[PDB]
Structures are given as C-alpha cells and as structure tokens.
C-alpha cells in the first residue's frame, strides 16, 4: 500500500490505510503474490 500522497507513501500493509488528504491515485495498493508459486513463463510477470 504505497501512498501517492504526502508523508506515508509506502508500506506492505495488512489493513485499511488511513491517509486522509490522499487522493484516489493518492494511494496505490499492489496485490502481490506472496502465497503460491507460478510456472515462470516471462509472458507472465516474473520476478523483477
């Protein structure tokens, strides 16, 4: 949950993030696959 607002602009979060004074793009959650593996074809977004 990297904020696109001032101050708290980062954090691999675990709940709802409260940046009041943050826009719609003023936050940005990235739903990352930290649970199971995928057969790493480069047509899938691999380990960058």
């Amino acid at each position, epitope marked *: 949950y990297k*904020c*696109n*607002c*001032g101050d708290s602009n980062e954090g691999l979060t675990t709940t709802d993030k409260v*940046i*009041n*004074n*943050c*826009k*719609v*793009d*003023q936050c940005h959650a990235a739903v990352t696959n930290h649970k199971k593996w995928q057969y790493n074809s480069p047509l899938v977004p691999r380990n960058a």
Partner: antibody
Amino acid sequence: QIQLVQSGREVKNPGETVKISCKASGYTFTEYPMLWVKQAPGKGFRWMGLIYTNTGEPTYAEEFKGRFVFSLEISASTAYLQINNLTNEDTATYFCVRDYFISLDYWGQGTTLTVSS
Amino acid sequence: QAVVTQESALTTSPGETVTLTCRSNIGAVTSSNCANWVQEKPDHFFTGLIGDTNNRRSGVPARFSGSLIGDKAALTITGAQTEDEAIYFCALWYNNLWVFGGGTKLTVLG
C-alpha cells in the same frame, strides 16, 4: 479543517460563466480534498464530484461534469467549480466538501450563481 | 441517486434526539458505504454531525450520530436545540465521494 472558501455570486448571463471558488483549507489545493458540489436551487447538494487531498480537485459526478467545470488552483490552495456557460435554470451554490473525516468532513462556503446579464 | 425517503421531518424541543429515520429507497448504507447523518446547515453550510457511517463527525455537537436507522439513513442528533436549525441529511459515502441527500432542514423548540 478542510473547508472551501466559497465562491461569490456568479451573476453571469445565460451562457455567462463564473467560478464558484473553493479555497481549500485544511490542506493545500494539492492537499485539500475538494468535492465539487452544486447546492441546487430546488433539492440541495447536486455533486460536482469528489477529489481527495493529494490531488484535491473534484472528479466530476454523473451529470456533475459539463457546465459545472472542476478545476484546481492547487498552488493557490483552492479549486474552482466553475458554473460555466449555463442556461437560465442552473442558479445554484458552488461549494466544496472536505474529503477527509470520512464524508465531506467540512463544507465549502458556497456561491450563488445565476444566469442573467 | 443518493436521495432516499430521507429524514425530511424533524420538529422537536431543545435537547431532543433529532432522529432523521429516513427509510432508504435502496437500503442501508454502511460505514464504508458512509451513511453519514451530517448537518447541511442553512445558508448552504455542509457539516458533519455523524460522518463516515459509524463515527460522529468533527465540528458538530457531541450527540450527533450518523449511521443506519430504520432500514435507511439514521441521524440520531442528541441535543437538538431551537438554535440548531440545520439539515439532518442521512446520506452515503460512495468511496469516491460523500453524497448528501435531500436532507431535512429543521428548526426546534427554543
């Protein structure tokens, strides 16, 4: 708190255009979540959109874009909900709604706009 | 459109718990649905007595509560007075704005 310094009486003609400004305090214009809003003559708050702080500028409603034009004087700590080029039946108040304090947590001061030259 | 069969009617005495028990034309808005019973004041003064659907809003009297009441918008404004003439608007928060309804402008006993 996030409170818009409201517009003046935008007395334009039918087709005349004037801004209902919302000098957004609580943040900057790039820090104050202005919801554009037309406090309509009949019903009340007809939304010109919501815009959270880090942008600030209210992204428009369903019918809330068009004649009411959302813009942001972000370095001037405000937006402009411009009652622009409207017909005669759009005399309404230009207001903001402070998108922090989970609804519009403050209100813009409003401005009475009327189409008559 | 976020205008249900709202709390449009409130005529009470000073200190009365002003209940905008608005029967929602769609249903109960949530805390993420942001069913806030704000005070849209006279002279177009948008303010929150209860905002975000489970929290009392800032800048209002302390007895305000904006939530779900009935099956719709529920304003429990504790301490509603005669000088408290304003609009109990129990409305929603769409997650991209807060949408105040028609509301009920009221004056009280006092």
